[PDB]
């Protein structure tokens, strides 16, 4: 199934073949798929998004990981693109991460962007 | 199942009960659900989005309807919020609508917004 993971930044070749796979099925590669969301400007990232959203239930653990992670850009995309499409339980699963991130002291400027994304999403998707 | 449709603009009461329903199951109400996406600033609209995205396959016909529709704001939300999350076949199902909308002559200013949304989405999600 690993052959199903995009091998580079433009690799849309396996998508039609991932669209067939399901929740039980795709989980073994699901975190690798998410790695494509590190930069949304990769032409592949846009193709991957909908797949990882459809299969958001099996992706939750791994979505947490990314938010506890040390990639600023990665969790920024994951927050910006995915939170809005989490179903109530899943959406509630990440509240804590959004909470923590909104909390960080703004040392560098990249930190700012993601504090602000979190305050605003919390503000919008939780009221 | 119709009792499952939000009865007003803030009505989040049936969501947890819709999250249980599936593709075979929910289609009878799916177009009514979409009617909540007419204004995204309705507190309910944000809760509904993820449901109608998860069930995008049964929603396709009805997504077309809205794009051929006469609601500017409605198709604007539907385009802005949903296209980015359509899986390849579904995404290809609406290309024509995006194409047509990008084509409209800009008489009034509200028309502008949706021409521009369509050129830009076409430009981004199709390359």
Residue numbers in the entry:
A (entry chain A), B (entry chain A): 4 to 130
Original paper wording:
Cthe_2751_is a 15.8 kDa singleton from an anaerobic, hyperthermophile Clostridium thermocellum, with an unknown function. Therefore, based on primary sequence analysis, Cthe_2751 is a non-Pfam singleton with an unknown function. Each monomer is made up of 8 α-helices arranged in a spiral pattern around a vertical axis that runs through the centre of the protein. The structure reveals an all α-helical topology similar to those observed for nucleic acid processing proteins.
Cthe_2751 crystallized as a dimer in 3 different crystal forms. To find out if there is a difference in the packing arrangement of the dimers in the 3 crystal forms and to quantify it, a computer program was compiled and a calculation was performed to analyze the inter-dimer distances of 2 neighbouring dimers for all 3 space groups. This result further supports the inferences of crystal packing analysis where we saw that the dimers rotate less than 3° along the C axes during the transformation from P4122 to C2221 resulting in only a minor change in crystal packing. A mathematical calculation performed on the dimers of Cthe_2751 crystallized in different space groups corroborated the findings of the crystal packing analysis of molecules packed in different space groups.
